[PDB]
């Protein structure tokens, strides 16, 4: 089961618990939900992680920053226009800030054969926050497609704080408002044993979930595919 959130007035952007990591493959353009928040307070009380991953770079910023009830830029672009500014309410204090390479996702305006499956694995554990990522050129815009692809690590940060909740940051009055055609996926990670097939080059070509079904458990016990 993977929860599907409709990104928009109808802000389907609640504070979701961060139980043992999250999987964040999504299909949309302009990056809509560029930023993410991870903390236990998320109201400047604690140094809540605010990752950006904007079109420029992932500006990691773990600071005791205030997140308003609706911290969104409110840009009704292509309906590019702006309504207010609450993405960055105020930074009461801070703990650390890192800036990565000025990369750029494929958020740019393009639908075609939708190749913007930017599948991400945000895992927080043992005082660390890891951003394993991959980009897959899929052909279907409907719900997550069928296929296999191993996710490479992208950043590894020794933050050391405790987090018990997360949230997603939306940059996007109520009369005749066109609901944004954007959505994302939240999948949860739990402790499991996986049998991974390292091919000749060192890349995982396939995996077996040892608790999915009796056949997979047999494969795991025998150590064979």
């Amino acid at each position: 089961n993977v929860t599907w959130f409709h990104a928009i007035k109808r802000f389907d952007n609640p504070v979701l618990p961060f139980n043992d990591g999250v999987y964040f493959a999504s299909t949309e353009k302009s990056n809509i939900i560029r930023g993410w928040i991870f903390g236990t307070t998320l109201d400047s009380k604690t140094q809540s992680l605010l990752i950006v991953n904007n079109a420029t770079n992932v500006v990691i910023k773990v600071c005791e920053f205030q997140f308003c009830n609706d911290p969104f830029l409110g840009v009704y672009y292509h309906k590019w226009m702006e309504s207010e500014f609450r993405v960055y309410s105020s930074a009461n204090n801070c703990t650390f800030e890192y800036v990565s390479q000025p990369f750029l996702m494929d958020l740019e305006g393009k639908q075609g054969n939708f190749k913007n499956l930017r599948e991400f694995v945000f895992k927080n554990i043992d005082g660390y926050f890891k951003i394993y990522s991959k980009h897959t050129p899929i052909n279907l815009v409907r719900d997550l497609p069928q296929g296999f692809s191993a996710l490479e690590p992208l950043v590894d940060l020794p933050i050391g704080i405790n987090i018990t909740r997360f949230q997603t940051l939306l940059a996007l009055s109520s009369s005749g408002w066109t609901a944004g055609a954007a959505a994302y996926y939240v999948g949860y990670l739990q402790p499991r044993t996986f049998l991974l097939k390292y091919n000749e080059n060192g890349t995982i070509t396939d995996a077996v979930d040892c608790a999915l079904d009796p056949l997979s458990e047999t494969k795991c016990t025998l150590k064979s595919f």
Binding site: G127, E152, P153, D156, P158, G160, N162, N201, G202, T203
Partner: protein, 424 residues
């Protein structure tokens, strides 16, 4: 006296020619002065955890300073820290009552260990503690140091609690002002110079680094040496030490991949920290040493089989004798390097097995010869579709066959053998 045959003996192996060290190219010293001259150490419930990474740490000076009342390293020895390399270091500093200095150690329990500050069972690191009464104690009571005494549930290890919510052990939840069954969680210490030992404040700092689980960042001031490959040497890459031969490889290491492990959890490849290049690791050659000898009374000369190694290596050790390396009769059999025996084209019935069809025999002048054993004498039976051989005579043969039937009947007394006339 040794009978004719081949006998196993202590193995052989190539010893390392030299040693290698490869550490990150960093010179900045870690901010140990900052954490050891922090003007005001935080409270026990507010114990402050500073990070230390991307630096060079010289623990020798810290260990040599006598100002530290307690200096205890658990998973590591303080002398060895100068040659180890770590991923990151957490320097956690605070002030506590002297008596609690025992609750600090791993596996302990108490109000300190169950409300404010808790260590892990498997802690690996070093705890340092020194009295700071003169620094942070006043006659009137330096109540700036508090600790959490009330909490609904025990805190997890390395957990910090700052909320001032009024706990209520006896139900009746209040808030703000205290009252029935409910009181202020934080209690201030009576740190005064007049206080006796134990009650006086103590400044404590604990280093709880992790080990060998990520690209190492902070470690000791020992200079890296040059990299030499294609040779049996001792390597020390970011503290990972071992012995073997280095060589380039076509591996694909991820940007955050450093080591290549083996099925036996041994490193068969590494990444040089100074140059982001992948370097293969292989244990330099070893093997067993067999000695081929006829009857010691038949003669005293011998041959030697270094099994499992191509002989080219042997000129390029453990057996304590290198005299025979002169060679001129080294023979590279599929079973190893045979030294001291003459190879010959003639084939005879096997006398002393060597392996892979090679046998050694002591024959005429006298010398030990290695040869391909002969299975027997060739013979073409005179077969034709109208010829028969019929025996015109016979022999009555009497042969012997020996079969073991029984072995010695032995019995053991448990208590006598294990515990000779001992009641304990």
């Amino acid at each position: 006296t040794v009978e004719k045959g081949i006998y196993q003996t202590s193995n052989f192996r190539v010893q390392p020619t030299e040693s290698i060290v490869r550490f990150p190219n960093i010179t900045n010293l870690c901010p140990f002065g900052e954490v050891f001259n922090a003007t005001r150490f935080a409270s026990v419930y507010a114990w402050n955890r500073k990070r230390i990474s991307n630096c060079v740490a010289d623990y020798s000076v810290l260990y040599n300073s006598a100002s530290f009342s307690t200096f205890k390293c658990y998973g590591v020895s303080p002398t060895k820290l100068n040659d180890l390399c770590f991923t990151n270091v957490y320097a956690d500093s605070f002030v506590i009552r002297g008596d609690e200095v025992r609750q600090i150690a791993p596996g302990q329990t108490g109000k300190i260990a169950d409300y404010n500050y808790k260590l892990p069972d498997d802690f690996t690191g070093c705890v340092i503690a020194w009295n700071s009464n003169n620094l942070d104690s006043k006659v009137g009571g330096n109540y700036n140091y508090l600790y959490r005494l009330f909490r609904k549930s025990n805190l997890k290890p390395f957990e910090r609690d700052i909320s001032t919510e009024i706990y209520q052990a006896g139900s009746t939840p209040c808030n703000g002002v205290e009252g029935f069954n409910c009181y202020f969680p934080l209690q201030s210490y009576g740190f005064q110079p007049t206080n006796g030992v134990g009650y006086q404040p103590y400044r404590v700092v604990v280093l709880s680094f992790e080990l060998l689980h990520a690209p190492a960042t902070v470690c000791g001031p020992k200079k890296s040496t040059n990299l030499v490959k294609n040779k049996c040497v001792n390597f020390n890459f970011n503290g990972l030490t071992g012995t073997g031969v280095l060589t380039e490889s076509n591996k694909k290491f991820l940007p955050f991949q450093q080591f290549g492990r083996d099925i036996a959890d041994t490193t068969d490849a590494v990444r040089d920290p100074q140059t982001l290049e992948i370097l293969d690791i292989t244990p330099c050659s070893f093997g067993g040493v067999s000695v081929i000898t006829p009857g010691t009374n038949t003669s005293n000369q011998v041959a030697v089989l270094y099994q499992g190694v191509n002989c080219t290596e042997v000129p390029v050790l453990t057996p304590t004798w290198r005299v025979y390396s002169t060679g001129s009769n080294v023979f590279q059999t599929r079973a190893g390097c045979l030294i001291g025996a003459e190879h010959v084209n003639n084939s005879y019935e096997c006398d002393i097995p060597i392996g892979a069809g090679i046998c050694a025999s002591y024959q005429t002048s006298q010398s030990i010869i290695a040869y391909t054993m002969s299975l027997g004498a060739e013979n073409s039976v005179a077969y034709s579709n109208n010829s028969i051989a019929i025996p015109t005579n016979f022999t009555i043969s009497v042969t012997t066959e020996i079969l073991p039937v029984s072995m010695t009947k032995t019995s053991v007394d448990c208590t006598m053998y294990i515990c000779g006339d001992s009641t304990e």
